[PDB]
Amino acid sequence: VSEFKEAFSLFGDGQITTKELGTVMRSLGESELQDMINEVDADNNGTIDFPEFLTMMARKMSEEEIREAFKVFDRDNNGFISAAELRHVMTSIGETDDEVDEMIREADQDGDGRIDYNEFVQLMM
Amino acid sequence: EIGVSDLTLLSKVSNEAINENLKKRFEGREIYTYIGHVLVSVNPFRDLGIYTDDVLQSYMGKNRLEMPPHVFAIAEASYYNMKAYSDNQCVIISGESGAGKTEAAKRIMQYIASVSGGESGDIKQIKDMVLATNPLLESFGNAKTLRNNNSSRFGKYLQIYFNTQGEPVGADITNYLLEKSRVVGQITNERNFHIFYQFAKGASQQYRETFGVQKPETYVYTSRSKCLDVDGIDDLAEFEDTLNAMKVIGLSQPEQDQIFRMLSAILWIGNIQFQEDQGGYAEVTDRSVVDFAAYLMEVTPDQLIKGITIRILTPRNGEVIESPANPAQAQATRDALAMAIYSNLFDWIVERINKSLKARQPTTNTIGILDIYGFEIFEKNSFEQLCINYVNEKLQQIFIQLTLKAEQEEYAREQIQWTPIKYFDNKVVCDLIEQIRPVGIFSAMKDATKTAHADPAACDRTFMQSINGMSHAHLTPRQGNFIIKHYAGDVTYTVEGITDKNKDQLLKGLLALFQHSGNDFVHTLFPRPVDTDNRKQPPSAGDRIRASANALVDTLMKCQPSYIRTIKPNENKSPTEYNGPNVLHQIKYLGLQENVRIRRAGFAYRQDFDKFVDRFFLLSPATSYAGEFTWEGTTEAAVKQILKDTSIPKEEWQMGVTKAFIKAPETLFALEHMRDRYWHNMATRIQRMWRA
Ligand SMILES: Nc1ncnc2c1ncn2[C@@H]1O[C@H](COP(=O)(O)OP(=O)(O)OP(O)(O)=S)[C@@H](O)[C@H]1O
Numbered sequence: 072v073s074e075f076k077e078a079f080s081l082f083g084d085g086q087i088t089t090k091e092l093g094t095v096m097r098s099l100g101e102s103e104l105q106d107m108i109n110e111v112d113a114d115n116n117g118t119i120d121f122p123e124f125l126t127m128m129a130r131k132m133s134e135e136e137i138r139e140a141f142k143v144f145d146r147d148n149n150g151f152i153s154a155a156e157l158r159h160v161m162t163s164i165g166e167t168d169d170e171v172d173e174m175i176r177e178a179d180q181d182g183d184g185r186i187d188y189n190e191f192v193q194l195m196m
Numbered sequence: 197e198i199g200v201s202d203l204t205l206l207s208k209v210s211n212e213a214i215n216e217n218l219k220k221r222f223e224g225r226e227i228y229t230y231i232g233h234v235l236v237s238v239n240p241f242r243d244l245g246i247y248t249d250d251v252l253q254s255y256m257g258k259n260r261l262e263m264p265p266h267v268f269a270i271a272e273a274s275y276y277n278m279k280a281y282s283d284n285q286c287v288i289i290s291g292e293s294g295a296g297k298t299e300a301a302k303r304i305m306q307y308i309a310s311v312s313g314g315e316s317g318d319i320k321q322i323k324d325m326v327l328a329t330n331p332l333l334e335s336f337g338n339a340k341t342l343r344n345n346n347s348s349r350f351g352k353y354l355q356i357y358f359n360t361q362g363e364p365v366g367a368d369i370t371n372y373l374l375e376k377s378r379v380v381g382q383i384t385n386e387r388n389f390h391i392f393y394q395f396a397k398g399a400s401q402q403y404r405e406t407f408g409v410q411k412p413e414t415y416v417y418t419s420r421s422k423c424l425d426v427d428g429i430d431d432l433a434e435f436e437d438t439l440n441a442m443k444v445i446g447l448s449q450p451e452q453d454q455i456f457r458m459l460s461a462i463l464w465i466g467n468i469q470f471q472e473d474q475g476g477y478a479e480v481t482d483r484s485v486v487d488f489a490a491y492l493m494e495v496t497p498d499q500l501i502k503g504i505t506i507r508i509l510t511p512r513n514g515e516v517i518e519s520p521a522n523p524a525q526a527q528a529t530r531d532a533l534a535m536a537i538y539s540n541l542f543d544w545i546v547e548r549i550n551k552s553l554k555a556r557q558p559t560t561n562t563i564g565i566l567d568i569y570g571f572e573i574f575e576k577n578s579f580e581q582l583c584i585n586y587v588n589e590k591l592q593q594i595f596i597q598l599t600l601k602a603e604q605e606e607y608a609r610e611q612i613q614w615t616p617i618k619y620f621d622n623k624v625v626c627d628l629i630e631q632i633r634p635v636g637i638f639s640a641m642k643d644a645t646k647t648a649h650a651d652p653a654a655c656d657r658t659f660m661q662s663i664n665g666m667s668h669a670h671l672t673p674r675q676g677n678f679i680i681k682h683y684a685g686d687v688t689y690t691v692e693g694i695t696d697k698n699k700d701q702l703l704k705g706l707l708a709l710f711q712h713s714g715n716d717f718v719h720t721l722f723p724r725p726v727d728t729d730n731r732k733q734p735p736s737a738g739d740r741i742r743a744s745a746n747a748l749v750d751t752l753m754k755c756q757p758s759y760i761r762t763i764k765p766n767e768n769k770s771p772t773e774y775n776g777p778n779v780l781h782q783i784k785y786l787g788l789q790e791n792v793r794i795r796r797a798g799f800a801y802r803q804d805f806d807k808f809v810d811r812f813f814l815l816s817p818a819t820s821y822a823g824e825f826t827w828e829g830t831t832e833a834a835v836k837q838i839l840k841d842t843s844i845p846k847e848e849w850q851m852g853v854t855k856a857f858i859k860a861p862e863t864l865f866a867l868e869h870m871r872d873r874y875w876h877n878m879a880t881r882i883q884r885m886w887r888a
């Protein structure tokens with residue numbers, strides 16, 4: 072709740088426009104965004120509000136957390152994932168084949184087609 | 197954009213406001229409207245082009261709120277909930293005859309087949325055979341009535357069985373009592389079942405030569421009603437659809453030949469006419485007709501004539517009398533044979549479909565679609581209409597139970613603040629029909645025929661007495677007729693011939709006839725071993741429909757319901773005529789205002805603590821570590837933790853004694869989507885590749 076209001080203040084009425092929202096989204100890290108924007112028009116045609124912002128963000132929606140995610144993916148449950156099963160999940164959520172080949176190249180020095188993600192987490196930081 | 201797409205958003209709530217909304221929308225070709233999760237569908241009687249694969253894909257993966265109201269959204273929601281909570285689903289569809297129950301059922305199947313995917317060959321087999329069932333069953337069980345040109349004359353409950361991948365592995369069709377009487381006669385301007393006109397008009401040369409199949413105008417069963425052609429129905433095209441579908445389902449060319457032999461036998465039996473002999477007995481008029489009918493039945497003409505014209509009477513235990521029938525009695529037995537053939541044929545077709553569609557893999561979940569025959573009223577109403585309207589009354593009762601009663605009772609048990617909304621509970625009407633110990637309509641009919649006297653007239657009189665003796669708010673005895681105050685209105689049932697219709701029992705000599713047959717399919721449709729005990733008084737049609745209906749109720753209460761209320765805007769099948777008063781009557785007796793009021797004041801979503809944790813534990817960092825459940829406390833406190841951690845406002849949710857309630861649909865769709873994007877958000881959490 073705080074995080075939304077502080078990143079809503081940064082980018083001073085409290086009624087904000089769609090372009091400013093696009094900038095907020097970019098700041099965090101396209102068509103779907105405007106789809107989220109377009110589900111309240113009674114209040115104002117080109118602007119929205121902070122309760123509406125909570126609404127549309129939930130309707131969309133540190134070190135340890137990034138650590139966790141690797142354990143989430145690991146079906147073996149042993150610290151080691153298939154590198155091509157990592158490729159696939161970098162493809163599907165999509166967030167460049169060359170970037171995935173470079174990032175898998177860093178971790179591909181293991182050599183067995185598998186990845187120890189604890190070491191690679193520490194490397195990544 | 198026309199009026200209000202979800203009646204809970206009406207500015208003023210009344211039946212008249214609802215009627216106005218549906219009428220503006222219908223005039224703007226928006227036949228679909230919501231009451232919360234419930235779908236109302238007004239029959240456009242015109243092809244609007246809203247069931248294209250383009251539209252269909254436009255509904256994939258959406259929730260009720262991201263798209264305009266559509267039957268596809270109800271089906272999407274059913275399939276989503278199936279794979280989400282791993283829960284069986286049932287779709288309930290109400291409507292008067294001609295309101296569009298059957299078309300909505302088919303659009304739901306269409307959506308499920310398209311969305312459910314599956315690339316395996318067996319899977320595509322299932323999907324195509326399921327779809328092929330539609331033309332086959334419609335051709336054998338639908339016919340033109342005054343109220344609807346493609347009128348379901350049988351009830352249906354289709355279950356689709358899915359594997360863990362959410363793919364169609366198998367199907368199962370449960371059929372309710374068919375209107376067999378149609379086979380032998382119709383109201384003027386009504387037709388027989390579609391199949392007879394398809395086959396009479398378009399029979400192959402082979403069939404036309406072996407089986408004698410002439411054009412429908414030559415048969416009494418297909419021409420006496422003075423209707424051979426139907427608006428918007430091409431019989432020869434549809435005959436070809438029938439044949440292809442039979443092939444898809446796996447009928448060999450012999451099986452098909454047997455079926456069409458029986459249909460041709462029926463038509464020929466229908467042309468047998470009688471005159472009165474020197475003793476007043478029945479005598480066949482044209483020997484050639486009976487001869488051909490016997491050929492088709494694979495019996496001798498003497499055997500067919502005897503079976504049609506001689507009644508086996510057992511007055512004492514050890515005495516049997518052969519009593520020759522008079523011409524009227526012989527016509528009665530003729531039609532009894534025709535009806536028995538067609539009914540047993542239909543039952544065989546349904547069993548064979550069930551065999552072809554049986555699960556080839558292990559099955560995980562089911563989706564059921566109910567398509568019953570709708571409430572209907574004619575100038576004359578007999579047992580047929582009583583059975584159909586009884587089923588509609590039971591379905592109304594299910595709707596009331598789920599949509600209005602059960603929810604409010606749950607509010608009261610869960611100490612949620614609630615002022616109960618009043619509604620008319622029609623269980624008394626169901627009681628009036630389906631009651632045994634306090635004799636009801638069906639039971640009274642059975643008791644009248646319990647004596648098993650040769651004469652139906654006396655049984656009808658005994659029944660009329662029983663009816664007079666009953667005192668019940670929804671029953672009104674009259675001179676040889678009785679009115680039932682059904683949920684949907686007054687229906688006047690004619691008492692004449694009603695108890696014989698209820699006592700749906702084949703005569704002894706007619707049953708003796710099938711034994712002599714040379715045809716294997718005839719022996720398939722009429723096994724000899726069930727004729728062992730003549731003395732017994734066998735089950736009645738009302739017994740069978742009572743059993744079917746209460747089976748159905750148990751089934752439906754074992755699955756997660758989705759609701760479709762179809763509305764018939766006019767009795768002329770006009771795309772532009774909107775009969776305000778008729779829609780208003782419908783709105784009223786369906787309790788659409790009550791649904792509106794509950795849905796506005798009600799909570800949108802209710803879930804048990806167990807299943808809620810099981811489904812939404814991933815949302816909380818407390819309750820979830822690395823996609824694995826881990827909670828040290830109670831389930832209730834886990835629910836409270838998950839809700840706090842999602843940071844939805846406290847006003848959007850409420851904690852009961854055993855269950856957890858979420859008020860607004862938007863909140864629920866948000867939680868569901870947050871749940872769906874969990875793996876997406878962990879993968880999103882590994883995306884800090886650009887260091888600076
Ligand atoms: N969604 C629809 N779009 C276009 N036409 C429709 C639609 N629904 C129904 N119709 C038309 O109305 C006719 C009746 O539709 P049905 O689905 O057969 O009604 P029904 O409720 O199943 O009737 P009963 O109760 O079985 S006699 C159809 O043949 C169509 O011509």
Ligand SMILES: CCOC(=O)/C(C#N)=C(\N)c1ccccc1
Nearest residue numbers: 374375376377580583697700737
């Ligand atoms: C949809 C309800 O169909 C029926 O129940 C039905 C028919 N037709 C009969 N019980 C019946 C039996 C024998 C003779 C005439 C009628």
Ligand SMILES: [Mg+2]
Nearest residue numbers: 297298347348
């Ligand atoms: Mg129908």
